[model samples]
Target: PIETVPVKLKPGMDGPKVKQWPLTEEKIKALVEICTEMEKEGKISKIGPENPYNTPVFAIKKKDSTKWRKLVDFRELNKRTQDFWEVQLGIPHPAGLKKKKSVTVLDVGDAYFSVPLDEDFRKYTAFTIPSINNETPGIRYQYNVLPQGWKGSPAIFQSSMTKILEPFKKQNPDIVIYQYMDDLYVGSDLEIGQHRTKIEELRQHLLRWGPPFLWMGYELHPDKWTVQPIVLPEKDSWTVNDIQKLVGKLNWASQIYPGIKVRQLSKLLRGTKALTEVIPLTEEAELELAENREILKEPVHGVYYDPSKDLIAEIQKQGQGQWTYQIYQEPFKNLKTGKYARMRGAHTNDVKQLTEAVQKITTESIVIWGKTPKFKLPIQKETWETWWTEYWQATWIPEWEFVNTPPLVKLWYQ
Candidate 1:
């Protein structure tokens, strides 16, 4: 019962008042349709002429592009709001993936709206109806429920859900469920015994449980075990929100396809600051995006973890004084998933990285190097000596064999 904790704002913090943005008649009608229904359902209420805060409400695209999801801009208010953390789940560890087979995803409808806002905090969520009688003088409305754009809404809603599901999760110790905000996935082995019963039990525990869908943002490839980003509608010039959309999808896909190119995507991201700014796509970013599409065209990354792959420990000199170390699993395949094999490697930009990499992989699984100094490993020397040579400048650079590097297959970068 206590899980229905009302959303709290930071004390003594004065949030900024926001004016509504100009909208076309069509979009105005769209907002009016939803807002009127929301008022009827008591999710929000029209307030008196005087209110301290008001945020602009607007509609953005959904996965279907043709449809819109209503959202309120709360950037200013979130700054004055307190933060709450949630448990990290969803991505299975290498060990956990061993049992993973059938993945069942359940969608949560109107997630943020399910939680209520504190009475005091509700004033910070006020807004105006643009379509009213030539914009009626001094009128506003406030959200009785958690507004969609508030940062705390998701965090609070997530914790609130776990609070309800905690008992169910503990009662069924054998059941493994991963919840990320509104999305829920029950990861299990191929056998479906008792899974449906457990699903029904959780169904009983939760509210607004909608129909099941494929793993959320990821589209399961029919030909392979990999996951691909859903196909987006083609756009010529993109709004800041459009880039925001691309970045959101790409970020999720990148977790699976770590090798997917994001440098130009990041560069495009670097150029924009506000969601309203309209910008054109550059050739460089488009080409990089194309590289991602090309890799994803076939089954690229195996999203599941495989413990059988080899782990090679390697370290290479970076700039003057620093070195980067990496432990990468050798290319392996699950023929059932796809013909394509892959490596999952991570590196730290420090001198003692290889030793750290060695610690993670076992002696049996790891292939380290034999004794060989830095000078002996086919050195690429620059014009030696001015004040003091760049490589020589860092005497702390240890001499060790930098071999045992996994054979480069051409698909790896930050």
Candidate 2:
């Protein structure tokens, strides 16, 4: 059901060339145990040498848990990996979607391991795990299945899942399944009885011939959802790097909450230097950062609105704010929860700061959300997309013109 993309290395690139990270005795034992388990499971195997591309790897504890995960350093291979196919991610906004009778969330465990790698690409997933005993110090192994650290693993896995779900999606147009990586959220606008029946139908389908993967757990929340505030660091003395990290976190939260000029803090860096450069902070910058943190810490309002059954006009009539608020349809959707709304002022005290953020973005024509900053755009959706198209074309034209090469089509004779 799942397939891995064959690695198409760049011209003259034989393999990844990097040093292996040193492992301690306990770490080595852990690696041994993991490698042995995977070997037994036929997920990985010992590899023969052939213009080897070695890269460092280590085990790290998963967040909020004591479990360790083995990872490979594929930075070198990442640069050379080719035949890029960008997967189109669906909209996270639930605004236009019909209210679900029930929400089913499913998490797939060891998702990467479930997808086997292409034979040719398996060698590129090679990594060395130190031996616990003195017999063999450098034990080399490559993954038979798709590994976590591989650059193309996600794209490959996503493509595989898309293929698997295509038929199911076509068969049941009433059921809405939104997939974010390995997490699947199933929703429906039908009555509770019908919705439950549809859910069971989908569940049976998944159990029989779902995406070729092992799902760890599944949860159902009927006509209810929770919104929790993002936990952030305290307002202590921060280094330049700390400030940058703080802004990064706030920027990510801004996508869900909308209207917060987290990008403006970067302007404090007057020169082209490292993020760690010890630059003196301005009062305005520091105050904005502090306020941004406060804005994030504000309580999120949760409203139970059944759009399908509930009257929108009646809700609008009763839900009027004391203050006249502007409704901003942001260009970006929520990055964390994959949910977006028309405006954020409906539920919380975050309105003041959020309003200011949107105004700044409109005035400056630059906004940062999630991990990256989006620049050179408009305020409205239609106009924003139009402006973005022109901006994207103009931005990349220089590279196309300078190289004097036409865009190459994937298929031959194109």
Candidate 3:
């Protein structure tokens, strides 16, 4: 059975009227037929002019593939709708996983259609198209189930799915379930023989729904999760779009492979103006790309820092007006290195703090700290300091003034 969500409109606004977009006759016919099919399946309904909001409808390709699906643009409606309550539906990064050998990825087809709209809120989702040759009124239609592209669809769908999966999670202690919107991941790190049955059970649990699961079991060889990056050709025939896509993959690879130099590739991104933008493959950029591929070929030694075991203390001399804080990993030894690293600086120093302070401290720096003869990653430190300086000058100072300005106004007015 499908669930429903209530749609709350903005104050003082009756609704919005959006005109239909110009589309081909074939396109219009295909979309209308889809609506008819949805209506028959009890997923949508025909409506009169009673509804306050009217949006336009069209068909868009699903993701980058050739498959198409009916979509209602709720841009204007979204503006009038009340702010949606925030929820955590983000995917867990595979690089950070210390456990998890077997992974079963399940994707729910037509995820939004599984959830229905609230009876009162259904009318607000009404959409219309151009009347045939301006002879009669355009047919008004609204979703029976929660439609795609709606402002609150993700939150509603995620909440509903979580409730459905909660019991399954509780029942199975060995298998860990993680959901990212509609993609459900069932992962287990137990013994191959012990965990295999749990993986199969979870797959069947997801199989009861709309789509089948994409299951990959690598118990004996778990390192198969980290695939080597594709080394670009020396001739450089790839388009700007290709390079852009490569850069995205490079960023992901950087998380797993510590030696990847992301800063060197910034030039390629900036130079790419359009799809036609040609990249003159310089010797330096080529070497960086090759270096990443080389790094990926090595064994994956995952590194992580646990804050609970971290030791932080403030130290000061008797006469010294200022105090300094030092952070030591004495309590929490590195998983791969088996040793603790030391970091010291003034209180609240930007670059010297943990990964919490420097967002892009890079995996290389962390890996370097874990090395037997501990050394610092130069680019990582330099990049953080550079970012800190730029942010402090541009945004940090402005934010400080903005935060403090209210108290100053009271003094001025008095």
Candidate 4:
């Protein structure tokens, strides 16, 4: 006989950190309640929907540590069933020959936020912490969890999370929940007819889980698996300066690749004091492009890259008069999604940029010929500022005019 088990939700000191309240419970409840009341009085036709939210998290921890452990349900153990079968390997080997197994690189995709831990910890699992942030509460950088590595890790983690979420399992039968380790995936088929009932049921049931969560949509069978990402505008007014700096580097490199001349690619490389000082409009365009580009590239809040329609529109606009682009629109198996992601045309642009960026090293080789030079990339903001301060001093163009023009890494490393 099949038994129903409780799916628990735990509140940890170390849950994923998010800045924005993508879809707060208070907002949702208020809207629905207010809208329903209004509708009963014949005030409005419908209510507005909240936006979806997604965030990145790193797996870096030991299951048994103060951090949460993985979750699993091992209620049933079959003892009387025994069978022997010959299993064939994909590749055959002769008798008395030992075949070495190939290593499989498993890509742990994005974790479902706030799921029971066991789903992730089952295989000697690795935990992830943020690689970058630490200012906020749950943004600490930590270690990873490897599959089946530690003793009792799997059982301990699974049991802990399961017990934590044990309280609210009877809320709705239609609600879907699947978790692997710390990653949680949840959805409900709350369409027009059943949407309200399911949501109200879910809201009351999940209140104990946490503060707020972003709601996502799912497709019904006939139109299965089709997704349209948001597009980045040609000009974004909210572009940051640092983003422009990064784009400057990428644009500079894109122009300098083998055959491409630096002068020809000036249109792409804006935001530089030197270049922008020369061409004021290019500078403005650079800022606009950087503003828009940020929405195109990011972990949390970028404009989604859509291919089918986006590319054609981009061609019509970006490649209209002066520039001609031979762009490739294709799908790539996202190691994370296990599904296809619309790979952007930036691949070609990136290759061209990398070639130029690497060449900058060679041209500046003269500066480091005799003296010791350091080519270290500062991983953190503090280190980066310190490194930049020293670098600008050593490579002072006004005084060290004879130093390699491009600033050689060899000189710095030596």
Candidate 5:
């Protein structure tokens, strides 16, 4: 029943442009064996060449594993499919595990294939394993279950995994468990004998599904979450050019909110041409001197949120010493288990240095009037509807004089 629900697509979509890529002879032999096993498992079926959709299939050696994973290049088809929708809102956060020492992660192997497909939609999930041993054109196949490259497969499996593991969570009310993509995390405070019995029960719960792997003694690395974000060791340290650059930087920070000060005071630095250009500090005191000194004296404390913590009351509690930080640590420790190669995505893990170059937009974008723009922030229960009254459009701050073009809507003409 875990894979009971069928996949759904958006109402209107065009046919996909079917494609296949060339592979080596050795790879073809491997593909033949895997597809044969897949047929035996009732995971895929042989189909004719007339299908409207088909993907090129290939294999790559999984990191640290002796095995290889067969994958389909479904890039073209994915554009027509809808993203997986979740009935429940958000998944649990790892930050809540800060209080627990020992954590265990169970990874579901061959994860996506575990979810069965809708009979009517199987043809859209068609694929080809190419010719082997000089066989002409080879045989085509359709997935009887979900395929890995389908874009929507992630959320699909996440929801399925949640459904299958619900009973175990209820039965073991004392343990803290969270299900993310294709993995389930079990955390506890119970000491040594803690993991053995619960581990058996957790594994037992997932037996009907994909083969799972166990990860032991996971950690929180709680100390790494917060650190001093800034320091100015060269304060009031001299150089005519130093003060000019300092104003340039603060002027940039002001763009986030006009309150940091308008161009009036910081314009002093714009007049300077030399790194040693001397600007007197005697008259600059009233605003920035105290503000910058206090800020430079100690680094602002940056603490990324601990998931289950309260948001509002803590905002006032954090006052000035706390801020959310985004730093990366050891890559998800997949360096251990060969089950899944901890997926690192475009989600930035990068921290780097930068300089001003007209050819680059870095320094200008941040320092100019700007905001990162918020869209459905963490607590927004539902998105604003598409209409004139939507939160963004109903700003109530629009000035008709600011723009020459007025509202375009008009009543029917006679």
Candidate 6:
């Protein structure tokens, strides 16, 4: 049945560890309510009515807006604030689109279990469970046996379980690993049999590396794909709408897409939702109206640096606006006569004709200009030039002696 969903997993149909999850009438009820609301909004996508092996997962497109409500900054407001915070703050808006050409994943099916570090777990579940104490502080988590509403318990538990699975990445590089909070997707090509094998390999490695990393079901398509929250163009050029869909997937990735337009969009990302939502304004989105005194105004590019003045001031002033040079000319003169001089005499013509003396210096300067790798993360042109030119001037490698010898090497040796 799972096969019909077109979501295929490689062989090794199942992994080795069948972790006994501690789900109860209450936790499931709370979880179901959260999941149902998510599903109703189409934030969650399901796979496999026909494919039993597939998993049902969420399709999160983090835009400037998000599907998840923002986490409360408790210190900002009183503990007894009269209003409902989730609504007052904001529901999570999707971030822009996501990384990967188009990536949409589903909710993982495997349920996670928590067991207390007690004598009972020591006897029955110790061997089956990973470490119970979470190393990271300020997070919420709980032992399955502990009472549910402990303030920091959920985050702590989730973070701890995630750290346990870190080594698997090193253990298997061929497997593609995608993780968000608790949802994990081990994605591969769409071929059914290969997908099954890959999942099984991941499962077996999980047993050897650590406890059961939750084996949520799989959401499969031939390649990574995301459904647009609004209409999206089918070509390669990205737009703000695409950016919104991407952030809707995750906030972190949006901050990282290096496209120039996305970089400009990144500046407006901070502050409250009302402040952020309508960035990259539409031309007619606002109407121009006259004030009683007559003039009306709008804030255009009020945030970005205005280069108009710098550009206008520089107009018609040079060979090129941004062109640069390494060598500047200084008049070479004859000291005795105090007159501007040239390298003349019988040898000047010989230098030009035989040695390529003048052209060599020109070619050398050009090569040392801007050669650098594309992903040169922190280094920029000025910084790179400093090191590159310094090395060129420095005599580190074996420098051949520029013999200012009498015309012929044979005559000098003799």
Candidates' C-alpha lDDT: 0.50, 0.50, 0.50, 0.26, 0.46, 0.26
lDDT tens readout by residue for model 3, 199-255? 666556655653312343323223332322234334447667766666766675565
Considering every candidate listed, which one attains the maximal TM-score? 5
Model 5 worst lDDT run, 10 consecutive residues: 350-359
Off by over 4 Å in 1: 1-8, 65-67, 85-115, 132-139, 154-160, 163-182, 185-414
Q: Which residue pairs in candidate 2 collide?
A: none
Clashes of each: 0, 0, 2, 49, 3, 69
lDDT score, residue 366, model 3? Answer: 22
Model 3: lDDT of residue 265: 61
Which residue pairs in model 5 clash with each other? 240-277, 241-275, 252-367
What's the residue-level lDDT of 208 in candidate 1? Answer: 39
| Candidate 2 structure quality by residue, lDDT tens digits, 1-414 | 454455677787777768775566766777788889889998899887763867766664432235455555565776678745646643333432224555554544256677787888778777888664546758888888866545566567776666666777898776666643334567666666666566566555556653222222233443453333455566545567766776666666666564556655777655666766666667787777777767767644342322233111000111222221111223222211211233443354333322323232221111111011122211334433222221120000100001123312101111
lDDT at position 264, candidate 5: 39
Error of 3 at 22 (Å): 1.6
- Off by more than 4 A, model 5: 1-7, 21-30, 56-63, 73-79, 82-105, 109-115, 130-139, 149-164, 171-181, 185-201, 208-236, 262-273, 276-414
- Candidate 4 displacement at residue 165 in angstroms: 5.1
CA RMSD of each candidate after superposition: 22.4, 18.9, 20.4, 23.3, 15.6, 32.4
**Candidate 6 residue-wise lDDT, 39-133, digit = tens:** 46432333322222211111121122223211111111111212223113422322221221222232321222232322221111111111123
Per-residue lDDT of 1-414 in model 1, one digit per residue for the tens?
124555566777776687776555665677777778888988899898667677766664433235444556565776677766435532232234224554454545365666677777788788876764466553368988766556566566765666766787687665556543334556556355665655656665554342222213311112223322235436777778877767766665665455666677667767538887877788998887787776656544553323444333343433333333333343232112111211122233222233322222221121111111121111222211111111121101222232334433211211
lDDT accuracy of residue 78 in candidate 3: 66
**In candidate 2, residue 377 scores what lDDT?**
19
